[PDB]
Nucleic acid binder design. Structure first.
Lengths: 120, 123
RNA sequence: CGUGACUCU
RNA sequence: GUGACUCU
């Protein structure tokens, strides 16, 4: 299973992610979107419950800023939710998120928690 | 290289080759085999590249030549058909081991039966 | 990973 | 082999 953080690097011709310090430009985001859209991905942040999702889109907003309705609505930043619920401080908050599933449903995953499913 | 269920059964029931077993399985043999197969995932080989996966929940008491299930006919009416007969009409397949049982997969009352010979064990 | 629904049986 | 939920 290839980490999406390695994949972005190959698509955008980096050798290290610390070679992209800023948010992606619109150009880069589009290039990357063309390669990952419609791939299946599996999440890394729930032990062996590697839930798989189809990639619908890539977010325009880095994970740091991208928001979703949380009800307990107090629209939340994707990053925050991973500190809160998952005890996880993203290393790459500047990077966008993968939009997975029903677009309507605002399911957003940081790159650093996603592996592309190979398999057979 | 997924393992044929027809080989696995030879391992479980200590057959040399499957041609040993020219007769249906006794109840003893069936219980013995079910203990080892229940719960595994298998994939099918008879829909070309549509290699669907199911969870085994049981082994049939009847061979595929006699095992029946409720089939709704293209009328309204629903009648009973045998597994071997269905594999002939639907899949144009004529089973080599009709005297062997079927794997029952996912959920009892779904009456989903697959002949051994059409199934491989997935890792 | 697991369960169902699935193109089944 | 496809989609669904233990989500975000």
């Amino acid at each position: 299973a290839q980490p999406v953080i390695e994949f972005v690097c190959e698509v955008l011709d980096f050798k290290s992610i610390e070679e992209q310090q800023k948010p992606l430009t619109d150009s880069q985001r589009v290039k990357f979107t063309k390669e990952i859209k419609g791939l299946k991905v599996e999440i890394t942040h729930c032990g062996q419950m590697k839930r798989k999702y189809r990639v619908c889109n890539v977010t325009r907003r880095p994970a740091s800023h991208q928001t979703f309705p949380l009800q307990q609505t107090v629209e939340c930043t994707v990053a925050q939710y991973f500190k809160d619920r998952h005890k996880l401080v993203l290393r790459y908050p500047h990077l966008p998120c993968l939009q997975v599933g029903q677009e309507q449903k605002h399911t957003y995953l940081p790159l650093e928690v996603c592996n592309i499913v190979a398999g057979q």
